[PDB]
Design a protein around this nucleic acid. Structure first.
Lengths: 212, 129, 156, 259, 225
RNA sequence: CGGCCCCCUGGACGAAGACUGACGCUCAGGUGCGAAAGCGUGGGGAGCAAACAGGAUUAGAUACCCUGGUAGUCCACGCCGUAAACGAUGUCGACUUGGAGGUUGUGCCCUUGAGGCGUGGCUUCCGGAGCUAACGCGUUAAGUCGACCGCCUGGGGAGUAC
RNA sequence: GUAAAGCGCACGCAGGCGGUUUGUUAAGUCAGAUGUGAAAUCCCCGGGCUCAACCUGGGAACUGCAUCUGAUACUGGCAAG
C-alpha cells in the first residue's frame, strides 16, 4: 500500500507481461526501502505478482538518481559495470563481461527488449573487451580521417598527437593552456596549430560548399 | 589555577570543533606547538600559526569534512595528577590504528606509529581520533 | 532477504475509571545481513498487531553500518539513557559474544564476530538503541582517510 | 562588494528616523486598514482614521506619499508609529514660523474656553488654549457669530506641553513637571489629551509634558462597571479630559471623562 | 537571474529586530540598522540563484513543486504563483502530517473531489436545505485546505516555503521524508532543517512576490526544457 | 547586616599608568568565625511569649481559638558549635551560540534631550548546543576539561550503643 | 541538585599539583647490553606411553631487581630570565 499513499516513487514500468517484469522505483530518503516494500517477507508480495496474471519474472530495482543510475538498474537482475553516453539518442552501451553476459543478456529476444524500454530509449549490450575495442576505434579516428584539420610537418605532428587526447577534432574549445606545458611552446603557434584545425573545419565547410 | 596547558589546548580544540569554529587561538608553548605540528602532519587540522614576540598566541585552524568535525575525539592521557609512560612494545593503538596517540619521546614528540617505527617509547600525551 | 527478530514483548497498563486497560509493546529489529539495520517499537491492544507494527516501523528508519568483513572496524562505545555498551571487533570463528537485545541487533546487522558487554542498564529498548548508536558512529578506514585528506595506506 | 557597503551608508544617508521623509507609497487600501512602505523592514498597519480629512472620507489613493514615524521597532511583527503625528511636526513648524515675522496668520475660530481658554482649531486638528489668548481684549467671542472666522494670534504657549492659545478677532491688533504642578490644578481645568494604552482598568490619557493620567474605569461614560474602556472610547485619540485631582507627591493625577 | 538592485527595491535586505534574531543566521546578516538586522545581499544573491537553478533542474525531470505560505498576507500571491506554472500549493493552514500522513489525507482529497463533482457535474439539485448547506460548508472547508494539492496524486518532489519558522511543521515533514526544501529564511528563522536556504524578508509583501515570481519563471523554464 | 550622626575599621570594583617577577591553586590534621534556641555571672524588662492558670471547643482537647502570663527575647563578658547553616550544587583556573533586564563604575560622542556607540564588575529571568533517570541545568552549567580536597556503597537497627 | 553521597564558612602547616624562555644535569622516563629472576607449574613447537590424562626435549615467559652504556621530548633538580 506504500505506493498507493505516495511512498514508492514508480516512474516507468518497462516490463514484458508473460515473461520478465523488471521495474525500478525511487523513494524520498526516509528509511522506506521501495524494493523491500515491493518484495515483503521472503518475497511475500513478490510471490503474489509472480503467480498473479501468470508465471512472470517480476523484478524490482532500487532507483538511485537521474538516468545514469537507471541504465545499470535496467540491466538488473545481473551485473553492470560501465556504460557509454551521447546526445538525443545516447544508446546505453551495456558494458559487462562474457561470463556475466550469459545471465545479463539472458535470452536473445527477451532481456534485450525488456531492458531496452527500461530507460525508455534503447540499450546496446556489449562486452568489457568490446568497449576497449571500440574505445580505441575512436582515438585513431579524430586522427583516422586522412588528417583533414590543421596539418603542418608530420614529424612534429606525431610527437604532438602522442600527448594529444581525443586527437585535435574540435579541441580548441577545450583547455588552451595544457599543450603549452609540452616541451616546445614559444610564441602562440600550437595555440595557433589548434586554430589551423578550426580553419580546417572551415575548409571542411568549404568542401561542403564544393559539394553544396 | 591553570595546571595543565596541553589539556586546556585539547579542550579548546574540542569546543571549537563542537561549535563549528573556524579557528581556535590560545597562548603559545613549545610543547603545544609541537603537538599542533603533529596534528597537522596527521591531518586533523588545516594549519597552525604562532604569532607574537612577548606573549605569542598559537592559532590553530580547524577542519570540517562534510559538515561534521574532523577531530572526533581528543583526550589527554598523561596529566599532572597522574603521568603515563609507555615502553615501545606497550605503546597503544588508538581506534585500532585509525586514530593516533601523541607520544613524547627522547627524539621529540611524534605519533605512536612513528615512535614504534623508531623503536622507543615515552610519555603518552593524548589520543586523537 | 531481510531478517527480522522480535527482541521482546511487554505488557503495559493504563489505569482508567473502570480499571486497568492492558496493552502490549513489541521491540523488534530488522537487517539485511549487511551494514544496514533498523529497530521498531510498536504498541497495540493485542500482541500480534503490536509486533506487526514493530516490524513496519523497523523497516523504515533503517541505518547503515560500515562492516569490515564479518566483524567491526574498531572497538566502539555507545550509550542511550542508562544502557551503556562496549563492543569490540573479534577474530573469525569467535561468534557473537553478547547478551540479550544487543545480541539480536548484532545478528541482523550481519556482524558475525564480536566481543561485547552491556554496562549499566540492560533495558532492552535502551540497550538496543545504544547498540545502534555505537554501530552508527563507528567509521571505516576509507572514511577516516577521506576525513583527514590522506590515503588508506598512510593510515594503515 | 563595497558597492553594498557604500549603498548601506547611502541608504542611511537617504532616510531618517522620525516621520519626516514622505516616502511610504500607499500600496494597499482596504477598509479599515491603509498600508505603506517607507523603506522599512515591514509594512505599516495604518488605520483609516489617520487619513480622512475633516469631514470623514478618505483622501489618498494608491501611490500617495506621507511619512509616518519611527524610533519604535517590531512589537512582534510590523513597523511604525502613525503618520498624523508627522503632521504634528508640520503644525509645529507653522507655529514656529510666527517667530520669524512675529505673526503666524491662519484661520482661528475659538467658540468656548475648555480650560479657561477658547479652543482654536487649525485645519484638521483642534488645540486647546489658555484664557487670555482667545481674545486680544475682553471682547469675548460669546457675542460673536458662533464658530466665527478670524485667525489665530498667539497669546500663550507652554512650549513643552502642547497647549497653545490664540487671538481670534481684531485684525488691527499686532523634576520638570512636578515642582510647579499648579497650572491645570485648581479643581476642574479640562484638557485635550491623547490616550496611550487602555489597561482594562484604565485608559492612560497623558499629554501635558511628561505626566500620567488614568480616567480609569468608573467615570468614562454614564455606566459604571460593564463598560470595558476599549469599547467605549478609542486607542490613541485626543479627548475631553480634565484633572479632578492632583498628587504632586505620588505623581497620580487622576483625570476624569464623565464631565 | 534576479538582480541585486531589484531585491533592494523590494526590501529583501531588511530583516527582523535585534532581539528576535537567530544566531545561526549570523553568517547571513550584514549589519544592524536602527536596531534592525540587515541581510547581506552579497551572500544572499548567489545562493538564491543556485536555488533557482536547482528548482529548474527538478522541473526538467517533471518534478512536483509545492508552494507553502500561510502568512495570510501573501496567501493570495503564493496561490497565484503556483497557478502561473500550474504547480501545487498550500496557502492556508498546513495540515499537521500532510506529507508524512499522506495516505489519510489522500482520502481527504478524494472526498473533496467527490464533493466537487456532486456540486458541478451532477447538476442533480433537489437536496434538503440544511443538508445542502452542510455539504456546501464542507466543500468550502476542503477547498480552503486542500485546493492546491488536489491534483497532486502522490508526494512532491520539492518544497518551496516562504517562512521557515512559520512552516516548521512542513519543513520537518519534508526532512523526515527527505524532500528537498527551498526556504526563504529571515533572521529570526531557523535554517538548519532547510536544504537550500534563502535569506530574505519573509514578511514584506513585495519581497515575497519577487521571490515567488522568479521561482515561477524558473519552474516554467524547466517545464519548457 | 536596615532610622540618622560621629569615631575606629575590613573588603570589593573601575581608571589609567608604574613596580615585583610565579611569589600560585588546593588542603588531611590544626586554627578561627559560626542563626535560633540553650547555659553561666551581672544588669535590664515596654511589647511579645515556651512553661503555667483560667474560659471555650470537643466524645475527650494535657491542642488549635480567647483572657492572662513567667523563663526568654534586650545589654555586658564568657560557654555552647548545631539548623532544610540550601543553590539540598566544595574551592581555583580555562573554553563553548543568544535574548530581556537590574545595579555599579568607566571611555568616546554635537549630552544638539531624558539620550548614541562601546568597555569592566556583581546580579534576576528565559532559552540554544550539550548534558541529565527525568525534572531540569544551560557562559553564575548540572556543558567541554585540568588541579586539589570532602563524601557515598540496599532499607531498617542508627547517626544509635560502647 | 532531587535516588546514598559537597565539611555551615573560612584561613592555613604537612602533603598534592604548578605560567613561560634559555642553559645545564640526567633523578624519573625511554633504548640497548650484562647479571640474576631455582626446578617444577602455565603457554608454543615437538617426542613417548594403542589414545588421553600422564610422562617428557627445546623454547617462550617469569611483566621484576641490580648494574653498565646511551637518548634528553616530557616531569624533576640546579642556574639565569
Amino acid at each position: 500500500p506504500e505506493i498507493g499513499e505516495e511512498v514508492i516513487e514508480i516512474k516507468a514500468a518497462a516490463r514484458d507481461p508473460g515473461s520478465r517484469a523488471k521495474i525500478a522505483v525511487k523513494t524520498n530518503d526516509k528509511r522506506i526501502d521501495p524494493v523491500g516494500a515491493c518484495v515483503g517477507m521472503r518475497g511475500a508480495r513478490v510471490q503474489a505478482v509472480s503467480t498473479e496474471l501468470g508465471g512472470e519474472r517480476i523484478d524490482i530495482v532500487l532507483w538511485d538518481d537521474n538516468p545514469a543510475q537507471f541504465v545499470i538498474n535496467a540491466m538488473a537482475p545481473a551485473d553492470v559495470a560501465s556504460i557509454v553516453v551521447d546526445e538525443d539518442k545516447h544508446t546505453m552501451d551495456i558494458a559487462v563481461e562474457a561470463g556475466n553476459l550469459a545471465q545479463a543478456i539472458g535470452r536473445n529476444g527477451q532481456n534485450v527488449r525488456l531492458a531496452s524500454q527500461l530507460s525508455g530509449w534503447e540499450l546496446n549490450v556489449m562486452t568489457v573487451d568490446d568497449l576497449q575495442a571500440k574505445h580505441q576505434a575512436e582515438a585513431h579516428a579524430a586522427i583516422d580521417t586522412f588528417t583533414k584539420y590543421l596539418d603542418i610537418d608530420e614529424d612534429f605532428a606525431t610527437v604532438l598527437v602522442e600527448e594529444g587526447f581525443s586527437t585535435l577534432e574540435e579541441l580548441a574549445y577545450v583547455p588552451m593552456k595544457e599543450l603549452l606545458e609540452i616541451e616546445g611552446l614559444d610564441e602562440p603557434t600550437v595555440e595557433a596549430l589548434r586554430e589551423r584545425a578550426k580553419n580546417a573545419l572551415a575548409t571542411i565547410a568549404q568542401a561542403q560548399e564544393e559539394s553544396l | 589555577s591553570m595546571q595543565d596547558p596541553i589539556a586546556d589546548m585539547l579542550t579548546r580544540i574540542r569546543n571549537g570543533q563542537a561549535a563549528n569554529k573556524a579557528a581556535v587561538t590560545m597562548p603559545s608553548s613549545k610543547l603545544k606547538v609541537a603537538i599542533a605540528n603533529v596534528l597537522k602532519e596527521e591531518g586533523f587540522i588545516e594549519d597552525f600559526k604562532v604569532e607574537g614576540d612577548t606573549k605569542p598566541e598559537l592559532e590553530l585552524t580547524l577542519k570540517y569534512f562534510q559538515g561534521k568535525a574532523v577531530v572526533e575525539s581528543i583526550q589527554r592521557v598523561s596529566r599532572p595528577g597522574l603521568r603515563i609512560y609507555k615502553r615501545k612494545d606497550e605503546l597503544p593503538k588508538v581506534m585500532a590504528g585509525l586514530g593516533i596517540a601523541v607520544v613524547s619521546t627522547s627524539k621529540g614528540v611524534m605519533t605512536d606509529r612513528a615512535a614504534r617505527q623508531a623503536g622507543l617509547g615515552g610519555e603518552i600525551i593524548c589520543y586523537v581520533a | 532477504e531481510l531478517q527480522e527478530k522480535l527482541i521482546a514483548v511487554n505488557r503495559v497498563s493504563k489505569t482508567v475509571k473502570g480499571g486497568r486497560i492492558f496493552s502490549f509493546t513489541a521491540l523488534t529489529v530488522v537487517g539485511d545481513g549487511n551494514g544496514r539495520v533498523g529497530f521498531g517499537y510498536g504498541k497495540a491492544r493485542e500482541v500480534p498487531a503490536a509486533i506487526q507494527k514493530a516490524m513496519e516501523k523497523a523497516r523504515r528508519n533503517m541505518i547503515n553500518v560500515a562492516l569490515n568483513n564479518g566483524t567491526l572496524q574498531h572497538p566502539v562505545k555507545g550509550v542511550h539513557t542508562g544502557s551503556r555498551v562496549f563492543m569490540q571487533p573479534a577474530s573469525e570463528g569467535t561468534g557473537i559474544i553478547a547478551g540479550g537485545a544487543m545480541r539480536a541487533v548484532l545478528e541482523v546487522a550481519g556482524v558475525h564476530n564480536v566481543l561485547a558487554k552491556a554496562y549499566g542498564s540492560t533495558n532492552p529498548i535502551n540497550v538496543v538503541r545504544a547498540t545502534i548508536d555505537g554501530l552508527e558512529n563507528m567509521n571505516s578506514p576509507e572514511m577516516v582517510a577521506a576525513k583527514r585528506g590522506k590515503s588508506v595506506e598512510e593510515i594503515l | 562588494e563595497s558597492f553594498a557597503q557604500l549603498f548601506e551608508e547611502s541608504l542611511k544617508e537617504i532616510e531618517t528616523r522620525p516621520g519626516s521623509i514622505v516616502r511610504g507609497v500607499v500600496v494597499a487600501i482596504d477598509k479599515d486598514v491603509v498600508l505603506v512602505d517607507a523603506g522599512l523592514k515591514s509594512e505599516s498597519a495604518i488605520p483609516a482614521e489617520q487619513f480622512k480629512n475633516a469631514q470623514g472620507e478618505l483622501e489618498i489613493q494608491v501611490g500617495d506619499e506621507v511619512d509616518v514615524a519611527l524610533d519604535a521597532v517590531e512589537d512582534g511583527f510590523g513597523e511604525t508609529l502613525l503618520s498624523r503625528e508627522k503632521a504634528k511636526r508640520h503644525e509645529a513648524w507653522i507655529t514656529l514660523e510666527k517667530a520669524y515675522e512675529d505673526a503666524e496668520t491662519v484661520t482661528g475660530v475659538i467658540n468656548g474656553k475648555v480650560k479657561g481658554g477658547f479652543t482654536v482649531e487649525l485645519n484638521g486638528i483642534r488645540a486647546f488654549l489658555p484664557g487670555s489668548l482667545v481674545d486680544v481684549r475682553p471682547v469675548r467671542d460669546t457675542l460673536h457669530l458662533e464658530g466665527k472666522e478670524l485667525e489665530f494670534k498667539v497669546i500663550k504657549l507652554d512650549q513643552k506641553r502642547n497647549n497653545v492659545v490664540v487671538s481670534r478677532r481684531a485684525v488691527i491688533e499686532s523634576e520638570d513637571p512636578w515642582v510647579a504642578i499648579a497650572k491645570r490644578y485648581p479643581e476642574g481645568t479640562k484638557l485635550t489629551g491623547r490616550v496611550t494604552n487602555l489597561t482594562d482598568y484604565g485608559c492612560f490619557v497623558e499629554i501635558e509634558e511628561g505626566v500620567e493620567g488614568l480616567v480609569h474605569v468608573s467615570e468614562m461614560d454614564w455606566t459604571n462597571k460593564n463598560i470595558h474602556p476599549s469599547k467605549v472610547v478609542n486607542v490613541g485619540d485626543v479627548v475631553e479630559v480634565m484633572v479632578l485631582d492632583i498628587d504632586e507627591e505620588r505623581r497620580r493625577i487622576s483625570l476624569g471623562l464623565k464631565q | 537571474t534576479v538582480s541585486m538592485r531589484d531585491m533592494l527595491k523590494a526590501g529583501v535586505h531588511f530583516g527582523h529586530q535585534t532581539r528576535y534574531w537567530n544566531p545561526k543566521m549570523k553568517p547571513f546578516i550584514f549589519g544592524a540598522r536602527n536596531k534592525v538586522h540587515i541581510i547581506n545581499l552579497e551572500k544572499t544573491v548567489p545562493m538564491f540563484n543556485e536555488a533557482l537553478a536547482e528548482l529548474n533542474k527538478i522541473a526538467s525531470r517533471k518534478g512536483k513543486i509545492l508552494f507553502v505560505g500561510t502568512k495570510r498576507a501573501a496567501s493570495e500571491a503564493v496561490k497565484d504563483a503556483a497557478l502561473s506554472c500550474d504547480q501545487f500549493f498550500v496557502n492556508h493552514r498546513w495540515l499537521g502530517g500532510m506529507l508524512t500522513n499522506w495516505k489519510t489525507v489522500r482520502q481527504s482529497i478524494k472526498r473533496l473531489k467527490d464533493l466537487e463533482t456532486q456540486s458541478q457535474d451532477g447538476t442533480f439539485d433537489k437536496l434538503t436545505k440544511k443538508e445542502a448547506l452542510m455539504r456546501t460548508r464542507e466543500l468550502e472547508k476542503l477547498e480552503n485546505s486542500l485546493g492546491g494539492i488536489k491534483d497532486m496524486g502522490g508526494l512532491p518532489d520539492a518544497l518551496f516555503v516562504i517562512d521557515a519558522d512559520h512552516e516548521h511543521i512542513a519543513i520537518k515533514e519534508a526532512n523526515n521524508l527527505g524532500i528537498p526544501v527551498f526556504a526563504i529564511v529571515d533572521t529570526n528563522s531557523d535554517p538548519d532543517g532547510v536544504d537550500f536556504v534563502i535569506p530574505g524578508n519573509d514578511d514584506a509583501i513585495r519581497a515575497v512576490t519577487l521571490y515567488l515570481g522568479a521561482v515561477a519563471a524558473t519552474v516554467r523554464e524547466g517545464r519548457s526544457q
